[PDB]
């Protein structure tokens, strides 16, 4: 064999970055918090076949060659300890592999970034700039904040959200008195200073447009942090680039008269404390993209700015088929939806997998995911599998369905994705094989003559059947088409059950018997066609089966009213029985039946095997006789016609 894969993962995400605190990330620097941290591993045999269904913690273990740094439990689970480089290893029979792993030091406040170099505001008005906390790596870092002015009488200051619980705060510098001073920032150990110069300017000219937030709205229903808005404010500035006033309330903003990009929104002023803000919100929006906004001061037009709509969380995007074919078995139970889905890899915007988790037993994610992007499916043959117009017909509450099976055959199912996903159709071939002998448990099945009547036959075999299964049959002058495997028993065609070595069927020679073997859930697995050979059928006895030559006899040595039955040359252990003497012959039983049958023993109740017997009789009366074999079975039958010549006389 050969180990084909050895990955570090947490909730089906290949980890790249890991910290000592146990917090991990993907490739896109996105944190992971679902599932357990573990080591993924896959194995291939010597030919290149992936081994599966194996036990993690029995068929293959795990160890950490550097436990001073990191523990890797045998099952596969992981719990890091301290920063460093650690080695990990796997076992299976006699294999072995190894890969490095690295625990990074926990993030710590390194840099305090700034969105300016020196602030300048008008007396009485208020200014603004951003701050970004960065760790030693240069990524975002959460922490608290304190801000102060060296000269509050000259310039006060305020910060949002209490200056706690984020990695991005907004500073708000309210300009008090004319002069120059400095603002001191404080977070943890480190400190940063901002030069401030309040100036009493105000010759208008030049208008600015400021985007406070990310400048985006997420039309997804669970974006975090809550990003369902864009926050704006209009400022008048002087020539020297210093804010002199706010006029957000005296301005008219307008989008296009009618949508042209599927990006639709609504603007609205939200006044409070004399401080006016212009808020943007979603108005439906079918698509993502930019939407330019036109500012106006009553009738003028000042400047334009573009906002951006997005939809996130998770949206199916990439899809690939593995094989250009699948062939079904009984385990599919007659619904080609299960095995189909397995022949498809799905990945989201991030090229990240999407799967039906077992945490959601009665609902499929990979399915429900595909439902959102699928438009239709076109079966090449509807008589085999029904095409899909409506997608809401697909569902998974354990019963994963349904591309139901109608008939045995082979088809082409092409899928129709939305133009939204821009995903080209993907064709898959599907074989629906008909049942055959291969799926038959009961061995050595052939037909034999019946014993109930004539023109009939019987079933029999060697071993018994896999407990739970059953048999049904049909018959016509032609053969019945074999059904697709997994199909339910067409209880209309096949309704006649078979209990082996008992049930029997009326039929003629040249005809055809079709059969099927069902499972516990009444699904087809087997199929075998019998042609009726004339010898397989049953018939009544004749003089043919009658071997012995019997001679009715009278004379002056036999009792009157009675006749002597002279037996001559029968076979070894064969026996003979006689019926009542009537004016008409008795009924002739079937060849093969036992003597012990009630309809028989009652009729032919008089054994005369000895040939030394005499029973009542008359001239034209008839008498019926039968021949039994060495095993207690009937063989022959001959109805004699008597004459007075062979009747007794004297007393
Ligand atoms: Ca939203
Ligand atoms: Ca926002
Ligand atoms: Ca638009
Ligand atoms: Ca699930
Ligand atoms: Ca036969
Ligand atoms: Zn076979
Ligand atoms: Zn017919």
XYZ file of C-alpha atoms and ligand atoms in Angstrom:
658
model
C 0.000 0.000 0.000
C 0.928 3.696 0.061
C -0.140 6.724 2.112
C -1.606 9.198 -0.374
C -2.391 12.027 2.047
C -1.466 13.406 5.467
C -3.215 16.663 6.293
C -3.829 18.968 9.228
C -7.520 19.832 9.509
C -10.392 21.138 11.618
C -13.911 20.708 10.231
C -12.800 19.621 6.740
C -10.505 22.647 6.375
C -6.795 22.243 5.715
C -5.132 24.291 8.436
C -2.074 26.398 7.652
C -1.831 28.736 10.618
C -2.157 27.518 14.199
C -1.591 29.283 17.509
C -0.764 27.882 20.942
C -4.176 29.008 22.204
C -5.674 26.382 19.892
C -7.120 28.871 17.409
C -6.554 27.906 13.769
C -6.990 29.394 10.300
C -7.455 28.357 6.679
C -5.460 29.542 3.650
C -7.476 32.752 3.333
C -6.539 33.777 6.887
C -10.080 33.010 8.061
C -10.394 31.646 11.595
C -11.929 28.233 12.241
C -14.015 27.370 15.304
C -16.159 24.370 14.275
C -15.441 20.699 14.877
C -12.330 19.247 16.457
C -8.722 19.839 15.496
C -7.356 16.666 13.911
C -5.021 15.034 11.388
C -6.559 13.904 8.106
C -5.039 10.890 6.376
C -5.868 8.794 3.310
C -4.361 5.551 2.031
C -4.042 3.850 -1.348
C -3.159 0.212 -1.986
C -0.438 -1.082 -4.327
C -2.522 -0.629 -7.507
C -3.670 2.928 -6.758
C -7.008 2.146 -5.118
C -8.086 4.327 -2.200
C -8.716 2.290 0.950
C -11.826 3.395 2.851
C -14.255 2.521 5.643
C -11.267 2.030 7.941
C -11.020 2.714 11.683
C -9.090 5.715 12.994
C -7.556 4.488 16.255
C -7.343 0.793 15.375
C -6.419 0.325 11.711
C -4.207 3.410 11.996
C -2.853 5.496 14.880
C -1.035 8.814 15.370
C 1.868 10.082 17.476
C 3.711 13.352 18.093
C 7.480 12.941 18.002
C 7.751 16.261 19.851
C 5.257 16.120 22.750
C 7.183 18.906 24.472
C 5.459 21.092 21.886
C 2.313 19.321 20.737
C 0.161 16.292 21.539
C -1.415 14.216 18.756
C -3.644 11.540 20.265
C -3.694 8.095 18.550
C -7.262 8.578 17.320
C -6.147 11.633 15.333
C -7.236 14.447 17.652
C -4.904 17.322 18.539
C -4.229 19.693 21.420
C -1.235 22.022 21.051
C 0.810 23.242 24.004
C 3.452 25.884 23.289
C 5.050 27.563 20.262
C 7.616 25.492 18.358
C 8.120 22.967 15.568
C 6.757 19.459 16.142
C 6.765 16.240 14.138
C 3.855 13.856 13.743
C 3.641 10.260 12.561
C 1.099 7.643 11.458
C 0.973 3.832 11.525
C -1.024 1.144 9.681
C 0.098 -2.484 9.613
C 3.746 -1.649 8.970
C 3.627 1.666 7.078
C 4.936 4.969 8.400
C 4.895 8.638 7.484
C 5.915 11.996 8.904
C 5.286 15.685 8.389
C 6.319 18.821 10.274
C 3.843 21.032 12.100
C 4.432 24.466 13.597
C 2.738 26.144 16.545
C 2.961 29.919 16.318
C 3.264 32.211 19.322
C -0.062 33.728 20.360
C -0.808 37.119 18.722
C 0.356 40.155 20.695
C -0.090 43.903 20.244
C 2.803 44.974 18.014
C 1.846 48.025 15.962
C -0.745 50.777 16.397
C -1.545 51.926 12.862
C -2.952 55.362 12.034
C -5.125 56.844 9.274
C -3.354 60.208 9.369
C -0.181 62.106 10.224
C -1.572 65.316 11.673
C -5.132 66.428 12.331
C -6.524 69.848 11.494
C -10.042 70.950 12.457
C -12.098 74.156 12.652
C -12.924 75.848 15.942
C -16.181 74.330 17.204
C -16.424 71.619 14.571
C -15.245 68.023 14.909
C -12.764 65.852 12.981
C -12.194 62.122 12.395
C -9.610 59.451 11.644
C -9.203 55.679 12.001
C -6.881 53.421 13.982
C -5.885 49.818 13.289
C -4.318 47.418 15.779
C -1.812 44.976 14.348
C -0.039 41.989 15.878
C 3.592 40.929 15.290
C 2.394 39.223 12.093
C 0.734 42.341 10.669
C -2.842 41.081 10.901
C -5.791 42.410 12.888
C -5.580 42.223 16.661
C -8.286 42.781 19.266
C -7.808 44.988 22.320
C -8.925 47.977 24.389
C -8.026 51.649 24.016
C -7.525 54.927 25.854
C -7.325 58.364 24.239
C -6.466 61.722 25.779
C -5.666 65.311 24.798
C -2.590 67.068 26.190
C -4.740 70.204 26.248
C -8.458 69.463 26.664
C -9.261 73.177 26.873
C -7.915 73.400 23.312
C -9.279 70.098 22.007
C -11.468 67.327 23.416
C -11.865 63.854 21.928
C -14.232 60.887 21.873
C -14.082 57.296 20.639
C -16.758 54.764 19.679
C -17.797 51.517 21.429
C -16.164 52.592 24.719
C -12.768 51.944 23.123
C -13.074 48.201 23.789
C -13.686 44.881 22.023
C -12.387 45.594 18.517
C -9.365 45.965 16.237
C -10.706 49.101 14.513
C -12.020 52.176 16.339
C -12.949 55.606 15.014
C -11.562 58.703 16.689
C -13.714 61.817 16.910
C -11.793 65.036 17.604
C -14.095 67.850 18.709
C -12.369 71.185 18.074
C -12.591 73.523 21.064
C -10.161 76.449 21.025
C -7.594 77.887 18.634
C -4.003 76.719 19.052
C -1.858 73.605 18.720
C -1.605 70.516 20.913
C -1.306 66.720 20.766
C -3.451 63.610 21.241
C -2.039 60.602 23.076
C -3.211 57.075 22.290
C -2.874 54.271 24.808
C -3.370 50.546 24.329
C -1.627 48.019 26.545
C 2.027 48.928 26.900
C 2.577 51.109 23.861
C 1.688 54.699 23.088
C 1.256 56.875 20.003
C 0.918 60.625 19.469
C -1.039 62.719 16.969
C -0.241 66.376 16.295
C -3.362 68.556 16.244
C -3.706 72.161 15.109
C -7.104 73.803 15.541
C -7.415 76.730 13.125
C -10.113 79.353 12.640
C -10.421 79.076 8.859
C -13.529 79.139 6.677
C -13.387 80.295 3.028
C -15.410 77.215 1.925
C -14.353 75.842 -1.515
C -13.880 72.117 -2.218
C -16.313 69.574 -0.731
C -15.284 66.178 0.673
C -17.055 62.809 0.736
C -16.125 60.429 3.561
C -16.878 56.727 3.912
C -16.981 55.880 7.612
C -17.675 52.155 7.471
C -16.324 49.443 5.160
C -18.303 51.100 2.371
C -20.245 47.889 1.838
C -23.513 46.110 2.619
C -23.860 42.354 3.015
C -27.245 41.125 1.780
C -26.601 37.760 3.429
C -28.780 37.136 6.485
C -26.037 36.290 8.998
C -23.010 38.485 8.261
C -20.866 39.237 11.327
C -20.223 41.870 12.461
C -23.588 43.300 11.395
C -22.809 44.914 8.051
C -26.201 45.935 6.680
C -25.378 49.605 6.177
C -23.106 52.297 4.796
C -22.424 55.387 6.874
C -21.825 58.772 5.250
C -21.255 62.414 6.126
C -20.673 65.520 3.989
C -18.060 68.049 5.091
C -17.157 71.521 3.912
C -13.388 72.064 3.896
C -11.260 75.188 3.348
C -8.457 75.696 0.821
C -5.806 74.392 3.226
C -7.662 71.097 3.803
C -9.419 71.775 7.117
C -13.025 70.913 8.008
C -15.245 73.953 8.597
C -18.757 72.505 8.755
C -21.288 69.724 8.320
C -24.072 70.024 5.722
C -25.259 66.404 5.550
C -28.837 67.564 6.145
C -29.042 70.187 3.371
C -28.124 67.792 0.549
C -30.194 65.635 -1.811
C -28.803 62.225 -2.762
C -30.143 60.181 -5.648
C -29.517 56.848 -7.331
C -30.513 56.132 -10.930
C -34.165 56.562 -11.976
C -34.429 52.818 -12.585
C -32.059 49.932 -11.782
C -29.453 48.823 -14.349
C -27.055 46.540 -12.415
C -29.323 44.584 -10.045
C -27.894 46.675 -7.213
C -30.748 48.593 -5.611
C -30.672 50.576 -2.380
C -32.323 53.302 -0.308
C -30.714 56.409 1.174
C -31.987 58.196 4.278
C -30.907 60.853 6.782
C -30.813 59.827 10.458
C -30.581 62.939 12.626
C -29.641 62.822 16.308
C -28.163 65.372 18.729
C -27.892 67.836 15.842
C -25.453 65.383 14.258
C -26.844 64.166 10.936
C -25.793 60.937 9.206
C -26.802 59.579 5.804
C -27.568 55.859 5.954
C -27.793 53.422 3.058
C -29.699 50.129 3.102
C -30.619 47.219 0.838
C -33.830 47.555 -1.195
C -33.923 43.938 -2.362
C -30.906 43.634 -4.658
C -30.720 40.505 -6.811
C -27.073 40.957 -7.742
C -23.874 42.218 -6.195
C -21.745 45.008 -7.617
C -21.082 48.730 -7.500
C -23.778 51.421 -7.536
C -22.696 55.024 -8.032
C -24.452 57.670 -5.939
C -25.064 61.269 -6.990
C -24.777 63.976 -4.346
C -26.566 67.292 -4.816
C -26.943 70.507 -2.847
C -30.567 71.172 -3.716
C -30.099 71.393 -7.478
C -26.355 71.547 -8.004
C -24.393 68.278 -8.051
C -21.146 68.132 -6.084
C -19.373 64.800 -6.429
C -20.103 61.112 -6.898
C -19.198 58.016 -4.914
C -19.548 54.281 -5.447
C -20.873 51.856 -2.831
C -20.591 48.067 -3.098
C -23.116 45.295 -2.444
C -22.074 41.764 -1.556
C -23.579 38.417 -0.599
C -21.459 36.067 1.456
C -21.823 33.426 4.162
C -21.510 30.538 1.698
C -22.650 30.200 -1.893
C -22.014 27.181 -4.095
C -19.787 28.126 -7.047
C -17.521 25.288 -8.238
C -18.601 21.776 -9.249
C -16.832 18.772 -10.753
C -17.841 15.257 -11.716
C -15.433 12.467 -10.804
C -16.448 9.744 -13.239
C -18.393 10.078 -16.479
C -20.444 7.062 -15.361
C -22.068 5.165 -12.499
C -23.741 1.755 -12.271
C -26.314 1.010 -9.604
C -26.670 -1.861 -7.160
C -29.359 -3.022 -4.721
C -27.987 -0.752 -1.977
C -29.338 2.191 -3.975
C -32.823 0.734 -3.356
C -34.082 2.178 -6.656
C -33.266 5.871 -6.333
C -30.259 7.135 -8.256
C -29.886 10.299 -6.167
C -27.572 8.881 -3.506
C -24.856 7.418 -5.743
C -25.059 10.409 -8.074
C -24.260 12.961 -5.383
C -21.162 10.978 -4.446
C -19.848 11.423 -7.996
C -19.735 15.187 -7.455
C -17.324 17.485 -5.657
C -18.700 20.843 -4.553
C -16.716 23.891 -3.465
C -17.754 27.404 -2.448
C -16.410 30.892 -3.305
C -13.214 30.065 -1.422
C -12.721 26.777 -3.269
C -13.747 25.168 0.018
C -15.740 21.889 0.226
C -19.414 21.572 1.172
C -20.847 18.370 2.678
C -23.806 16.677 4.326
C -22.679 16.564 7.963
C -23.885 13.650 10.119
C -24.739 16.233 12.782
C -27.742 16.909 10.522
C -29.097 13.348 10.048
C -32.488 14.177 8.544
C -31.284 16.906 6.182
C -28.571 17.029 3.540
C -26.370 20.101 3.140
C -24.589 19.043 -0.053
C -28.030 18.448 -1.561
C -29.782 21.555 -0.276
C -26.674 23.358 -1.534
C -27.078 21.949 -5.027
C -30.803 22.724 -5.013
C -30.044 26.440 -4.802
C -27.899 26.402 -7.961
C -29.694 23.762 -10.021
C -32.431 24.762 -12.474
C -33.326 21.485 -14.139
C -32.212 18.013 -15.171
C -32.856 16.343 -18.501
C -33.081 12.566 -18.606
C -32.250 11.261 -22.081
C -35.009 8.712 -21.505
C -38.075 9.489 -19.375
C -39.291 5.876 -19.564
C -36.178 5.064 -17.524
C -35.814 8.035 -15.169
C -38.019 11.113 -14.999
C -36.360 14.394 -15.903
C -36.478 17.218 -13.348
C -38.417 20.387 -14.120
C -39.127 21.390 -10.530
C -36.082 21.208 -8.271
C -38.098 21.283 -5.024
C -39.013 17.653 -5.866
C -35.530 16.748 -4.603
C -35.443 16.219 -0.848
C -33.567 14.388 1.899
C -35.237 13.338 5.120
C -33.232 10.113 5.358
C -35.177 9.087 2.236
C -32.762 10.708 -0.222
C -34.890 11.256 -3.309
C -35.773 11.272 -6.016
C -34.612 10.253 -9.447
C -36.899 7.248 -9.222
C -36.385 4.181 -11.402
C -39.135 3.106 -13.808
C -37.461 0.546 -16.035
C -34.144 -1.213 -16.643
C -31.918 0.705 -19.047
C -29.074 3.213 -19.379
C -29.344 6.983 -19.697
C -27.738 10.425 -19.784
C -28.591 12.954 -17.085
C -27.444 16.467 -17.907
C -27.766 19.106 -15.203
C -28.895 22.689 -15.697
C -27.343 25.270 -13.401
C -28.399 28.887 -13.117
C -26.705 31.399 -15.407
C -26.076 33.151 -12.080
C -23.523 30.515 -11.114
C -22.330 30.601 -14.736
C -21.701 26.874 -14.306
C -21.818 25.004 -17.587
C -23.987 21.861 -17.751
C -22.341 18.612 -16.678
C -23.450 15.342 -18.233
C -23.437 12.036 -16.345
C -24.182 8.561 -17.640
C -26.201 6.206 -15.455
C -26.689 2.489 -15.922
C -29.824 0.881 -14.486
C -29.096 -2.845 -14.744
C -31.864 -5.444 -14.767
C -31.747 -8.240 -12.183
C -30.402 -11.632 -13.242
C -29.340 -14.987 -11.786
C -26.321 -13.324 -10.173
C -28.565 -11.939 -7.443
C -30.195 -15.299 -6.690
C -29.633 -16.950 -3.307
C -31.618 -20.174 -3.693
C -29.538 -22.661 -5.637
C -30.495 -25.522 -7.921
C -33.901 -24.338 -9.084
C -35.701 -26.464 -11.681
C -39.298 -27.570 -12.232
C -41.080 -30.883 -11.679
C -44.551 -32.385 -12.236
C -47.184 -31.333 -9.693
C -49.352 -33.560 -7.515
C -52.512 -31.463 -7.082
C -53.934 -32.055 -10.554
C -53.033 -32.008 -14.249
C -51.426 -29.387 -16.472
C -49.441 -28.190 -13.465
C -45.895 -28.054 -12.094
C -43.966 -27.345 -8.889
C -40.912 -25.491 -7.585
C -38.004 -26.992 -5.685
C -34.367 -26.240 -4.944
C -31.315 -27.374 -2.997
C -30.472 -24.883 -0.243
C -32.809 -22.401 1.408
C -32.884 -18.683 0.598
C -31.235 -15.802 2.449
C -33.766 -15.331 5.274
C -36.030 -12.342 4.646
C -36.203 -12.696 0.871
C -39.215 -14.071 -1.006
C -40.318 -15.217 -4.450
C -43.053 -14.245 -6.876
C -43.861 -15.329 -10.429
C -45.906 -14.766 -13.559
C -46.697 -16.571 -16.802
C -47.716 -15.899 -20.385
C -46.967 -17.121 -23.917
C -44.010 -14.717 -23.827
C -41.236 -13.711 -21.405
C -41.669 -10.856 -18.918
C -39.078 -8.055 -19.194
C -36.569 -8.058 -16.350
C -37.032 -5.113 -13.977
C -34.353 -2.665 -12.906
C -32.742 -3.727 -9.606
C -34.001 -1.865 -6.525
C -37.493 -1.507 -7.996
C -40.488 -2.372 -5.855
C -42.471 -5.467 -6.751
C -45.008 -4.508 -9.386
C -47.730 -6.121 -7.257
C -50.031 -6.082 -10.305
C -47.881 -8.230 -12.619
C -46.223 -10.290 -9.899
C -48.870 -11.099 -7.272
C -48.536 -14.877 -6.996
C -46.147 -15.726 -4.154
C -44.093 -18.938 -4.041
C -43.430 -21.084 -1.015
C -40.896 -23.531 -2.420
C -41.988 -27.160 -2.484
C -45.714 -26.459 -2.183
C -47.092 -23.823 -4.552
C -48.008 -24.869 -8.089
C -48.989 -23.201 -11.353
C -51.299 -23.960 -14.252
C -49.588 -23.701 -17.648
C -48.987 -25.316 -21.042
C -45.911 -26.529 -22.899
C -43.929 -23.933 -24.839
C -45.081 -21.295 -22.378
C -42.829 -19.157 -20.200
C -42.580 -18.658 -16.453
C -40.878 -15.510 -15.201
C -39.675 -15.194 -11.607
C -38.218 -12.584 -9.269
C -36.539 -12.651 -5.856
C -37.393 -9.783 -3.531
C -35.552 -8.516 -0.443
C -36.857 -7.769 3.057
C -38.143 -4.379 1.891
C -39.796 -5.965 -1.179
C -37.167 -4.820 -3.711
C -36.011 -6.920 -6.669
C -32.544 -8.486 -6.726
C -32.980 -11.677 -8.754
C -34.590 -12.742 -12.011
C -34.771 -16.087 -13.846
C -36.917 -17.222 -16.780
C -38.183 -20.805 -17.082
C -39.372 -22.388 -20.302
C -41.971 -25.078 -19.701
C -40.917 -28.476 -21.032
C -43.756 -30.986 -21.445
C -41.956 -33.357 -19.063
C -41.864 -30.728 -16.295
C -45.684 -30.915 -16.231
C -47.982 -33.438 -14.550
C -50.496 -35.870 -16.012
C -52.840 -38.608 -14.836
C -52.005 -42.315 -14.911
C -52.730 -44.531 -17.912
C -52.385 -48.151 -18.882
C -48.898 -46.831 -19.667
C -47.866 -46.573 -16.031
C -49.860 -49.749 -15.405
C -47.417 -52.648 -15.652
C -49.164 -55.611 -14.074
C -51.463 -57.850 -16.089
C -54.581 -58.491 -14.030
C -57.238 -60.951 -15.135
C -60.756 -60.828 -13.665
C -61.838 -64.431 -12.991
C -64.951 -66.407 -12.080
C -65.872 -70.074 -12.348
C -67.263 -72.591 -9.878
C -64.481 -71.780 -7.408
C -65.452 -68.152 -6.787
C -68.308 -66.778 -4.701
C -71.385 -65.621 -6.595
C -71.775 -61.864 -6.966
C -68.005 -61.582 -6.571
C -65.092 -61.961 -9.002
C -61.500 -63.098 -8.572
C -58.629 -60.736 -9.354
C -55.749 -62.810 -10.697
C -52.604 -60.705 -10.467
C -49.717 -61.646 -12.716
C -46.174 -60.256 -12.983
C -45.924 -56.949 -11.137
C -42.612 -55.312 -10.258
C -40.793 -56.192 -7.016
C -42.162 -53.913 -4.296
C -45.051 -52.441 -6.285
C -48.505 -52.689 -4.706
C -52.082 -52.544 -5.965
C -55.352 -51.048 -4.768
C -58.900 -51.438 -6.064
C -61.867 -49.078 -5.944
C -65.593 -49.655 -5.628
C -67.441 -51.572 -8.358
C -69.775 -49.130 -10.115
C -71.696 -48.866 -13.385
C -69.123 -46.287 -14.485
C -65.336 -46.052 -14.160
C -63.708 -44.232 -11.240
C -61.626 -41.051 -11.497
C -57.968 -41.414 -12.531
C -55.491 -39.714 -10.147
C -52.365 -37.800 -11.125
C -49.144 -39.686 -11.792
C -46.750 -39.062 -8.919
C -49.043 -38.423 -5.965
C -48.776 -40.499 -2.784
C -51.390 -43.101 -1.888
C -52.049 -41.541 1.510
C -54.062 -38.660 0.005
C -57.667 -38.610 1.270
C -59.296 -38.322 -2.156
C -57.340 -41.468 -3.079
C -57.231 -43.918 -0.149
C -60.982 -43.516 0.364
C -61.765 -44.353 -3.248
C -59.216 -47.107 -3.847
C -59.357 -48.423 -0.290
C -59.157 -52.124 -1.117
C -55.625 -53.501 -1.390
C -55.422 -56.533 -3.654
C -51.645 -56.731 -4.083
C -51.819 -60.469 -3.356
C -54.119 -61.193 -6.303
C -56.019 -63.636 -4.111
C -58.973 -61.336 -3.479
C -62.603 -61.301 -4.536
C -64.927 -58.301 -4.280
C -68.587 -57.735 -5.193
C -69.413 -57.283 -8.894
C -71.933 -57.686 -11.719
C -72.032 -58.159 -15.499
C -71.557 -54.762 -17.116
C -70.189 -53.111 -13.969
C -66.827 -51.318 -14.210
C -63.869 -51.544 -11.855
C -60.914 -49.199 -11.505
C -57.428 -50.160 -10.326
C -54.143 -48.367 -9.684
C -50.477 -49.266 -9.299
C -48.178 -47.997 -6.552
C -44.366 -47.965 -6.836
C -41.600 -49.024 -4.410
C -41.806 -45.647 -2.635
C -45.570 -45.255 -2.065
C -46.306 -43.229 -5.202
C -48.983 -43.893 -7.834
C -47.998 -44.922 -11.370
C -50.637 -46.677 -13.461
C -54.387 -46.873 -13.874
C -56.647 -49.249 -15.795
C -60.441 -49.441 -15.762
C -61.623 -52.945 -16.600
C -64.945 -53.945 -18.125
C -66.275 -57.221 -16.724
C -68.333 -60.052 -18.201
C -70.376 -62.730 -16.436
C -67.769 -65.193 -17.720
C -65.472 -63.983 -14.956
C -67.966 -64.001 -12.078
C -68.522 -66.597 -9.346
C -71.441 -69.027 -9.364
C -71.847 -71.643 -6.642
C -72.467 -70.909 -2.956
Ca -27.236 41.229 5.804
Ca -21.004 48.877 6.765
Ca -28.762 49.923 -9.728
Ca -26.654 16.587 7.295
Ca -36.046 -28.652 -16.274
Zn -22.879 -11.674 -12.511
Zn -50.327 -13.058 -22.934
